[PDB]
Each structure stands twice: as structure tokens, then as C-alpha cells.
Design a protein around this ligand. Structure first.
Ligand SMILES: [Sr+2]
Ligand SMILES: [Sr+2]
Lengths: 700, 705
């Protein structure tokens, strides 16, 4: 056909039927059953699936009943696995599994583990590099006139996932604790807020829930992904992440940061990946709407479900859309005030990306392990896409020369803020530089429980360390950018905001230390704005200039008060507030700068249960939320979730008068034993990004 | 909420800057420009010293990093003690200094290096004449010019004036430009030349044809800006060769309905022009700008054609390259599988992989700052997609030096272009029971010759040694190991030589295949050779096996034997495909040793060319009558014959149609051209019909002033 002899098979759903005729089998028994050896041994017993699911590079048992006794003399047969529509032994999409005296490592094969009166028990092993997907099983009998082969049989469809338990698999992770956490765990916690006030919230990955695995295969099919590569964790993450953010009626989620969300579910409402993945599957069109942590919850569900050890990572004060520039420009005016016309770039209060576990045989030795993949697009070499998989280890050392998109995730965590006064005659002069703001704290969920784990030391060295300065020296050599010459760049200023609840008042003190044996005349300015979590300004709710005289060896503190009415009028979804404080030392003309952010605390949702905490047993769940506003919250949606206990659900209240409390009781029949969890979220026409949860423990 | 200002990613979108911009509190006896002068005109210094005097454009065109002159007329003599002003260049809807989309350009005592600055070089009564210099890292695009006079209350600035818009192209003549070529011969060839030759055919009969890059033609420069626009390329990226080529190559192959061309190798070409008819890039590029939808149809040389025009037009040196025996769709593998039956025959069912007779790609020149030192220079970029990490996209820019050294750890997509050229042929026997046995590896077929057009004229320049070392030698071996550890995959692991040579025939003639054996040992061996001949596409994909032959031969100890075969025209005339190539597989079994020998070659049937004769005044501005002439070589009728004529700077692409043409008849076509360019020009003709296709012809003319 001009282009290629055979078309590409980039669909695991398209199937071809192998001919039945160019000894015979009567029944093929696999030991599926979620209690049986196979599933229990492959660690695929939690999957709500009624087919055999194994993990590559490992043996599993199967049994073939022949019409007559298998005789090693005049008999010859082999099990066949085939995927997609144009199988090719050449591409790994047609695997003849030959009978062997013993199984070698890294090769396919079947040992006749035992035979008894017309049946043969088999031990089948698979290559540790096997294509991940859902294969078809057949049994071929090689007669002197042609192969005789089984008919199409759905109940034998075997799923072959990645295998972090196998040391020959690139996805290998050598620690059962981590294995459980990064692969087996189907509940997760997402960190946000601001570096000073870390807020957490649970998300449901739900990889083992009914259907999720088949949709993970659907995304790939939708990406027209060559089957020959689904066995590559790299290209798998490379393609998988590009599918997450809907590039025009294409991907999974439709991103959006417009506090309206004109026609869908506000990003702040979702409780997990489940209903999201199932909605994409059923509608077959992008789901509206999503934002970083959402994209992150979903991509993580996709990975874990296939068996690639993944986890979500949150960076505080993220320099997004850096275009590999290591500098953020803050434009101060001649008298010292932040210039709003020019200052157009912002630091995100926080940003969430993923890390995947794998080896990097495409790079030198030492860069394998955790890989950074950011599904939130930004301009990189290809032009506005997801970034990664970039080796966190190389990032740490500044080796941004190795793929993929490493110079852009490096800048997310290493940028500097440059305070530059643009003279009114059209000139510039950089007054100061803040090397310590961006990438102040990078964090993730710990292995034990719902705690926090500081993984900052992994992306970067400690400041001042030559290794730190070296990584910069290196980064700068292969694509890092520091366009402004910061040449020549004794008062110590710093301020603090006390965190408050939504609707209440708070203080913001400014401290001024003067170590010199002399006095100064400072002129300060406080500028408070209302911002999106991305750090983008909506408005300046409070401006305030100060006039401070500093005696030598003086230390003066001033206290400003932010009254609730000064902000309650114009707040945004995540309750973010940004503070800028700059000063001029009239004598020497030095400009001091400092900026911080805070979020207002939102009261949680209450989840309470009564009944029988037993699988199969009806257990009633009670949900209740109190509208803590002096206004009536309209069109209130409360979301309920809890994998293994409840499928996701949601309810709506036309309105909730100021200060009244609602309640929602639904009865669930927990289908999983052990510690499970219940998760709630709130979203209305105004207040949203409200969450609640509960630690149930199902019995049986 | 995502970003404070939308993305500035359109050169055609514009912002209207205010004329007056004051602030605060308080005649305006400040200076008002009465007119601006940008000594453009093809004769003038700017267009000439910048190498843009060739662009058939009416606006000022200038190459980055180098100075140019302008003259501003004021309402009253410039006084260097009171008056303060400056020129401004801005681009896109959302200009930003932070990002080089707004450029102040101050008056300066003396121009520094790689920094915008204007020096006052002459002051006549009421007129300042500046010498303006740009930054070598300037964005490439069409900027708007404005003059701004600073008052202590604000700026007063000129109003929208479309006639003073300025293009700033890359500049291969500037030492500080990433894209710098150190000598005029190369710069002239790879940047100033708007004509090239494409090498096709097969190694043992290299065929050439003229292709018009036509970068300087009217509308091309702008179309080029539209491409980057259709790809939503961030303006701040448009000053980077790497991004321009990483992004621009991706626009060439219309995935869905985005890019420039819809690729097709079906031999039918349902509702479009056959890739074999295109004479040059001008046609496509314009057609696409008017359609705003992908152009049908193209194949590897056409994408390389249209991409080359793109590259050179913006100012990046680039050349088309033609690799013979290409392993495209290699997925990093370093092996090609050919399957055999137990009796020695080729297993027509299992052998689904094919080697392209020839595959063209582009080489683009630029430094490489994202890579270590040493990998700058020519960079391979393949606009013809294939599975790479991202899967099914163009590949490149891959540093050609990194490839030659197996350093595939560097971006972009190096392993793929590496196996496009350095891969082996494995002959495997698929035993009747289901097993496979590796008979022999042919390691010298793929990547035989990589060739490009020469600097002087239309000859070829063997560049195979830039991609690889010599077969055998240590460096080639080490290179291979260096690759294998960083990506390249390589799964699998009796002295009676054989070989056959084909005597290439002309379309419609009988010809011969001459196979010759030889027995070195002192043994009387016995061979059973097989011969399979297939009609194929240039990619390697077969359509049919028109001739199957099998014969046993005995070999004397220390001997030689030449078996000749006569292939009659009739055995193939009935089912040829475009480009007329045929494929042969010669395999033999020496039953004593059960050793298997195998070989393959290809042949393209020579087709007679089109005749072009110039009659008249070969003088710029003066008419000249051009006569295209084609004779039906076949013994049957051709119908719906489309003839094409093109000549950059002599005539724009014109095409004529003939309802049919009887066998062995001749048709003439007379057009009167008015050459607007002098010197060595050329004329390209092409032919396409429902039957015959892939028929080209050219003529060299020298037009005097
Ligand atoms: Sr830092
Ligand atoms: Sr070779």
C-alpha cells in the first residue's frame, strides 16, 4: 500500500480472528479467581475484573485439557498470545509460547509443570519487556498438514501489566513498602495552600475500580499509540501525559482557570479520577474542566493502574511558563512602588506535577529512577506541551542537555526574582534579586500514612553549596537563561501575616532591623492584591505607604490590619491573597523588596457514619455542611466518593440560607475490607474548594 | 487566571499604540517627524548590503545583527541638548520588552556588540540620519516602526504607517548569529540560491531533477510567516533556529488538517496533484495560503522541497539530502528482517518490512547550545514522520556529528535517523514447525550513499562520510556500541559467493539480469538458486511478483559461473507503478552445506525527458518564447496530460492540459516569458498523466541586462 506493507496496529481493541485450520483441546483453565494463586501472586487481586490479570516477567499457571492424553512423542503444541489487528512476531504483537524443559529469564515459555490422564498443567512465563495491554489466548496444534488452532475466546483474554516486583523490568522498585504505596494504593493526598500554610485534601486514584483499567487502554488507543511501544514506560508516560490536557477536542481534560467555568464541573469539585475517566470513556470527548492537581490526579491513576510506580509532587512558589529563563522580573517605580503596568509575570503559589519510576536506558548511567513529568502545558522546544519525562536526578545537577524538556522543569524550581526599577525616561536598573523564593518547598505523601514528606533535597542542593553553584554553572551551559546582568547586587526587612479564617480580620506586621551605626529615613509601601492560585492579580484591595526612621542598631515593628470587608468583597476560589512590600532608604537609595502569600482557611465538610462496618453490609453515610457566610450560597453541589465503599455520587441544593446547615445521608454497601476512606467536596456559584473526609475501617 | 496577558503568538495580529501618552500635570514644541526614510529600494545600500535586494518585496527587508540606515525629517532642526527621541520596533498583539516583542532602540554615542542602538551619523537642516543596529538574537518577523519623542510629561509618537514595516531575517553573514556560515561560496549556495536538484533513482543509476525553492518569489516570505502563525508559534521562539525547525518541520506534514501537505503514496491521488507533478515550492506555498488548508499531495522529496524554501527564505542555510537504501519506520531497531522458506525461497508473507529505494531529508545549519560543544553545524531534520518517542512525527534536529558518532543520547530523535542509515539486513528461515533460524546478515545495503547537490553547479556531493565511518573500521564499530547503550536496539544476534548485476533498461524495453556464482573451495558444490522479481513503490512496498525463476547449478572447485536472464518488456509493462522501479531477490541453497546465500538489488526504468527550447531575447524585461515539447514514448495513448513549466525569476508556475496524446505523437507548448531576473536562470518542466508520470525536464538560460 505505497507507504507501508501492513498498516500500523495502534489499537488494542481492533482484533483479527486467527484461522482455526491452517490432538485437540476441550477446555482451558486458568486459575483466575481473585483468591487463587495467580492473582494473589501477581498482586492483581484488587482489580474489579473478571479476567486473568498477570504482571510481566513472572510465571503463572494455566491448565489445558486435551481430548486425549498429551504424548511428548507424536504431539506438538504451543499457546499463542496475539494483540491488535495486524499481529507480527516481529513487533511483539504475536507471541508463540513454546514448551520448554525449563524457563530462562527474559524469554517467553511454558514448562509442563504436570500431566495426569488427558490434562496438562502449565507454568507460563513472559518476557520482562512485554507489551502492556489485553492479549488474546489461543492454543495451536502443529499437525503435518497445518496448525489446528482454538476459536475466539473472550473468557481467556489475559491482561499483562508492568511489574515493579520483577528486577528485570525497567519499572522495578525494590521495596514492598514503596511498592504498596506507589502502585497498590488507590487513595492519595494532595498538598496545596502556600509554603507557610500547607493544606491537604484527599483524592481517589481508584485504579482498581471497575472499568478504570480498560479506560487506561482507551486513552492509549485514543492516542493512536503503536502497540509495539506500550511496553515502554518512557514513551508510555511521554504519550500518556500529552493526552491528559485536551489539545482541542482531543485529550482527556479541558483545562481552565476562569473562575466561572461556564459549561462544566469546576476543577475544584472533583473528588477523584474515577468519574473523570469514566466520563471521558462514555462521552468519548474531553471532560470540562481541569487544572494542575486535577491533571495530576488522573495521570497518576493512569500510571498506577498499568503498574508504573507514580506519585504526585507539589512545588511551592513555582516559576511556571519560564521558557528556560532563570529570572522573574518585578518592575518597581522610581519612588519604590511596584509597577503594575509592566510587572506581568507571576509565581504560582503552588504547582502539582507527577513523578514516575523507571530506568532511563536512553541516558547515561545514574539518571534512572524517579522521572518528572508535568502534564500542565508550557512553551518548551516543541511549543506549549506537557514536559517530561525529565530525570529528577539530572535536574538536581543541572544536566538539562538530556531529554525530555529538562530545562523547563529545572527553571520551575530554580528561578530568581529580579527587582528592576524602570526609570521614567525609559531606562532600567536592577535593584535587587531574590534567590530564595521559587521552589522553596517541594513535597509529597509519605509512605506510612496521610502525612507529608519533604523531597526538596532531591530536586536541588542546599543553597550556598558549590554543588548548587555547579548545577547552575552547568545548567547555564546547556540552555538555561540568565539574560540580565546582576553585577553589584545595612537594613534587614521582613514581614509576616497571621493566617485567618474566611470572613475574619488579620494582622500583617513589618519588622525593620538596622545593623549599621547610623540612622536612615525609609519610605515603605504595602500593596495587597487578590490573586488566583497561579499568582495572577485580580485587584489591589489595599495600598499603604509608611514612613520609618531607623536609629542605628534599631529594630522597629509596625502592624497593619487587614479588615474582612477590605477583601470579602472580591475573593477568588482558593482564597489567595498576595502581599508586596518595598522600601527605599532615602539616604542610600537602596530598595528593599519582599512578597508573601496566604490563603484564608475554609471550614471543612463533616462526614459521619452509623451502622455495620462490614463488607456487603448496609452502612449509612451522613454528610453535612454549614454555610458560614452572611450570604445565601446558591446551586450547592456536594460530592461524595470513597473507593471500594462507594462509587462517586453528588447532590444539589437550590440554595443554602446564610448560616444554615444541610445534611445528606446515603447508605453504602462497602465492597472492600480493611481501612478505606470517604471523601467529600463542596462547590457552589460562589464558595467552592471546600472539602471533608472520613477514616472508616470495613470488616470481614 | 492562567496568565496575566494572553500569549503573544501571532505576527499578523497587531496592537495599536497611542500617539500621545502623557501623565500627571502640565506648547508641545517638541519635534514632530514629518516623514521617515528607510533607504530601501533594491539599488540602495540597505537591501544590497543586507543581501535582501533579491526579495521581490516592496518593504524594507533587513538581516539581524547588522546595521542599516534611515533618515527622519523633523519639523525643526534636531538640537542634541533639548530633543530626546528614539525609534521603536514592536511585534504582535501583546508587545513586551521583557520578551523582545517591544524594542526601544535608544540614540547612542557608538554602537556596541549585539545590542540595539542607533548612532546619529549626519545632521542636515531639519534631518537626522541614523545608523541602526539590531541584536543578533532578534526575533525573525515583520516589525512595525514608530518614532517616539519623549516629553517630560510622556511620549508623543508617530501613527501607524504600513509602508515602514520592516522584516528582520536570520543572518548567516554575521559572526554573532547562531546561523553563521563563514564563507561566501556556501552562503551563496545554501541561502542565496533559489534552485536545487533532487537526487532520486537508485545507487547504480542516480537520477537528478531541478526543483525551484523560489524563496525570493512574491508572496513566499509572507507565507512563511503565516506557517509559523498557523502553528501558533510564540513570537519569542521565532529567533531560535532549533525551535523554528523543530516546530516548522512539524507543520509540513498535514496531520489531520493542520499542516502544509497531505502525504499520499497510493498511486491514485484521489482529489489532488500527484507529488510527481510539483515543479517547485512556490505553487504549494501560495496555494496553501489561499486555501488555508493542507495541499494534496506530497511525498518525501516534496516535504523536503517545501521545507527547504521555508528555511532559506527566513535565512537559515539548508540543503536537501538523499540517502539511498533507507530504513525508515525503523523504531530504533538496527536490523531489518527478510524471511525465507525452508527450501530457500523468500517468504512473501512474513516479510512485511521494506527498504526505501531513496529517502530525502533536509540538513539545516545552526549552532547547538543545548548540546555539548562539537555538535553544531548541519542538523538532520526529517519532515516525513515515523514513530519516535512522541510517536509519528518528524524527527530532528538531530546533530549530524552526534549520529556519525553513535551519540544518540542527545535530542532530537537521534536513534531514528541513525538506524535510517546504519541498519542491517538479517536473513531468517522460518521453519515449517514455527521456529526461525538466522542464515546471514547483509550489513552493507542500507545507507549505501548519502548525496547532495554541489556548491558550484548541478553535480553531486558525496556526504556519506559525514553520517558514518567506513565499514569495517574501529570508529564505525565503537559508534555502533555507543548507540546500542543509549537507545539503538538490536534483538537477534562456505565460500561460494554470488551476486547479480542488472543492466538498467528504458521503459518499454526488454532487459537482462546477470547472476554470477563462484566456488573458492575445491569442492564440487550444488546450488539451487531462486529469483523473485517484484513491481514496487520507491519506498520498497511491493505490488506484485511478475517473474519467479528457480534453477540448480553445479560449481567446479575454484570456478566461476554467470547465469543470464532475459526479462521481457511484456512481463512487466502491464503493472508498473510511478517511478518504474523493480525489485529482485536472488537466493540460493548449497544443499551439501545447507548454507543459504541471498541478495537484493533494485532498478528504475529510464524514461525519456521533456524538451525545452528558448527562442528570443534572453534579456531582462524583454519577451522570449519558450517551447515545451513532449513525445509519447509508449505504444498506447496517455490521457489528461498535465504539463508543468516553472522558472523562478523567469515565469511563475503555469500548467497546461492536453485531453490525450496518441502513442509516439509529439506535442508542443509555446509560452512567451518576460524574465525579470538576469544571469544564470533555469527552466523546469514536468509531466503527469493517468498512465505515465514522473517525467521531468530542464533548460539553462542566461538572461542579460
Ligand atoms: Sr534558588
Ligand atoms: Sr552498515
Amino acid at each position: 500500500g505505497g507507504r507501508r506493507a501492513v498498516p500500523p496496529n495502534n489499537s488494542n481493541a481492533a482484533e483479527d480472528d486467527l484461522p482455526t485450520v491452517e490432538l485437540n483441546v476441550t477446555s482451558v483453565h486458568l486459575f483466575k479467581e481473585r483468591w487463587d494463586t495467580n492473582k494473589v501472586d501477581h498482586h492483581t487481586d484488587k482489580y474489579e475484573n473478571n479476567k486473568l490479570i498477570v504482571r510481566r516477567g513472572q510465571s503463572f499457571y494455566v491448565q489445558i485439557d486435551f481430548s486425549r492424553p498429551y504424548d511428548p512423542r507424536r504431539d506438538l503444541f504451543r499457546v499463542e498470545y496475539v494483540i491488535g489487528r495486524y499481529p507480527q512476531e516481529n513487533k511483539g504483537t504475536y507471541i508463540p509460547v513454546p514448551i520448554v524443559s525449563e524457563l530462562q529469564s527474559g524469554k517467553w515459555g511454558a514448562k509442563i509443570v504436570m500431566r495426569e490422564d488427558r490434562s496438562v498443567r502449565l507454568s507460563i512465563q513472559s518476557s520482562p519487556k512485554c507489551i502492556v495491554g489485553k492479549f488474546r489466548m489461543y492454543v495451536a496444534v502443529w499437525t503435518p498438514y497445518g496448525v489446528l488452532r482454538t476459536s475466539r475466546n473472550p473468557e481467556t483474554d489475559t491482561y499483562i501489566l508492568f511489574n515493579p516486583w520483577c528486577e528485570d523490568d525497567a519499572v522495578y522498585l525494590d521495596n514492598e513498602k514503596e511498592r504498596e504505596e506507589y502502585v497498590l494504593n488507590d487513595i492519595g493526598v494532595i498538598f496545596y495552600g502556600e509554603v507557610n500554610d500547607i493544606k491537604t485534601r484527599s483524592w481517589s486514584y481508584g485504579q482498581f475500580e471497575d472499568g478504570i483499567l480498560d479506560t487506561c487502554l482507551y486513552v492509549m488507543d485514543r492516542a493512536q499509540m503503536d502497540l509495539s511501544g506500550r511496553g515502554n514506560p518512557i514513551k508510555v508516560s511521554r504519550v500518556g501525559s500529552a493526552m491528559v490536557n485536551a489539545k482541542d477536542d482531543e485529550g482527556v481534560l479541558v483545562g481552565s482557570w476562569d473562575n466561572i467555568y461556564a459549561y462544566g464541573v469546576p476543577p475544584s469539585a472533583w473528588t477523584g479520577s474515577v468519574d473523570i475517566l469514566l466520563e471521558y470513556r462514555s462521552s468519548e470527548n474531553p471532560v470540562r474542566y481541569g487544572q494542575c492537581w486535577v491533571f495530576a490526579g488522573v495521570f497518576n491513576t493512569f500510571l498506577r493502574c498499568l503498574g508504573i510506580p507514580a506519585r504526585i509532587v507539589t512545588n511551592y512558589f513555582s516559576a511556571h511558563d519560564n521558557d528556560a529563563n532563570l529570572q522573574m522580573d518585578i518592575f518597581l517605580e522610581e519612588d519604590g512602588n511596584v509597577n503594575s503596568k509592566l510587572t506581568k509575570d507571576s509565581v504560582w503559589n503552588y504547582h502539582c506535577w507527577n513523578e514516575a519510576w523507571m530506568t532511563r536506558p536512553d541516558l547515561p548511567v545514574g539518571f534512572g529512577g524517579w522521572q518528572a513529568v508535568d502534564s500542565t502545558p508550557q512553551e518548551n522546544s516543541d511549543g506549549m506541551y506537557r514536559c517530561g519525562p525529565a530525570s529528577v536526578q539530572a535536574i538536581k545537577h543541572g544536566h538539562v542537555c538530556f531529554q525530555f524538556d529538562a530545562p523547563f522543569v529545572f527553571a520551575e524550581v530554580n528561578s530568581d526574582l529580579i527587582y528592576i526599577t524602570a526609570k521614567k525616561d525609559g531606562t532600567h536598573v536592577v535593584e535587587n534579586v531574590d534567590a530564595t523564593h521559587i521552589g522553596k518547598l517541594i513535597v509529597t505523601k509519605q509512605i506510612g500514612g496521610d502525612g507529608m514528606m519533604d523531597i526538596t533535597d532531591t530536586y536541588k542542593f542546599q543553597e550556598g553549596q558549590e554543588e548548587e553553584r555547579l548545577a547552575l554553572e552547568t545548567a547555564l551551559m546547556y540552555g538555561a537563561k540568565k539574560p540580565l546582568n546582576t553585577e553589584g547586587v545595612n537594613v534587614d526587612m521582613d514581614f509576616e501575616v497571621e493566617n485567618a479564617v474566611l470572613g475574619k480580620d488579620f494582622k500583617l506586621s513589618i519588622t525593620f532591623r538596622n545593623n549599621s551605626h547610623n540612622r536612615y529615613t525609609i519610605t515603605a509601601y504595602l500593596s495587597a492584591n487578590i490573586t488566583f492560585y497561579t499568582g495572577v492579580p485580580k485587584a489591589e484591595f489595599k495600598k499603604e505607604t509608611f514612613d520609618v526612621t531607623l536609629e542605628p542598631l534599631s529594630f522597629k515593628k509596625e502592624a497593619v490590619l487587614i479588615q474582612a470587608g477590605e477583601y470579602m468583597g472580591q475573593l477568588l476560589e482558593q482564597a489567595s491573597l498576595h502581599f508586596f512590600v518595598t522600601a527605599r532608604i532615602n539616604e542610600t537609595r537602596d530598595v528593599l523588596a519582599k512578597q508573601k502569600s496566604t490563603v484564608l482557611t475554609i471550614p471543612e465538610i463533616i462526614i459521619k457514619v452509623r451502622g455495620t462496618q462490614v463488607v456487603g453490609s448496609d452502612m449509612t453515610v451522613t454528610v453535612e455542611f454549614t454555610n458560614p457566610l452572611k450570604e445565601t450560597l446558591r446551586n450547592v453541589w456536594v460530592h461524595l466518593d470513597g473507593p471500594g465503599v462507594t462509587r462517586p455520587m453528588k447532590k444539589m441544593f437550590r440554595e443554602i440560607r446564610p448560616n444554615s446547615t444541610v445534611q445528606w445521608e446515603e447508605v453504602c454497601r462497602p465492597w472492600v475490607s480493611g481501612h478505606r476512606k470517604l471523601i467529600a467536596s463542596m462547590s457552589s456559584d460562589s464558595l467552592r474548594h471546600v472539602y471533608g473526609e472520613l477514616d472508616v475501617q470495613i470488616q470481614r
